[PDB]
Amino acid sequence: AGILFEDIFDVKDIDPEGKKFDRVSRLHCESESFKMDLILDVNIQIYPVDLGDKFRLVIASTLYEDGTLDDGEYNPTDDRPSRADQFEYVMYGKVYRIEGDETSTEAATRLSAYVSYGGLLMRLQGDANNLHGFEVDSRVYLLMKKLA
Amino acid sequence: YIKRVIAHPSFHNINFKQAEKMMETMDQGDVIIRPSSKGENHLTVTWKVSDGIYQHVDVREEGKENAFSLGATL
């Protein structure tokens, strides 16, 4: 499959510290199935989001359901079936940091995975077992779909 | 014969008799490339067919900027 994580999130706050950029807003969301915490910068000019919205979020290492990997280069003329077809907002990024509450003697119980989508930053935080596909320097896709 | 500039292991700026003299003590199948008396666009390849027997092959040079240089296509 190539899916690292999936859940449904509720938007709980937008730009709590005030708006920092005109076309980008920071979402603070919580998921219900896995109790994950999310901070996500979104291009709201092209994909507007309102308080209390719900969306399905998928983090995938590939867009191809057959699990094939990508070169990381724009391939606009490829027409293989793509996960992106099922989703409205798709970003491509890189894991730049993984933090945890591990001690010198104990493995982490809570992990935080940080991703940069060309400078739009995401922080996915929760129980370490949900975040075991994330590796620093790996490229991921973020798939988002509002649901009513 | 005209001197040339070819930094090849088997190239020697010697006349035919000089090449044979040095080639008598060499092994079978060895090759010595020397300037060709035919002109400035030719090269002579001498190889030892057998002890005491030597074959000279004339190689033409095409596409050279100077006479001493090696032709682009041989």
Binding site: - | V5, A7, S69
Partner: protein, 82 residues
Amino acid sequence: QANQKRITTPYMTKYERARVLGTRALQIAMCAPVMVELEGETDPLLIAMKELKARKIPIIIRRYLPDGSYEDWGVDELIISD
């Protein structure tokens, strides 16, 4: 100062590089025999740079010590960084 124990730096200095390249280029420009394959090269400085990278410059650097002695280093015995 017997070259058995040469005590100066085993690296070619930047000043030695500059002057060796210049001197060899002038020699090439004056029809000195070349030490590498020139394939499609004509500028004497570029040829001298090729020879330097090939470790073929036929020049010896004589380094004078403050005491008055000297050490002779073949240009190919020195480490070329830049």
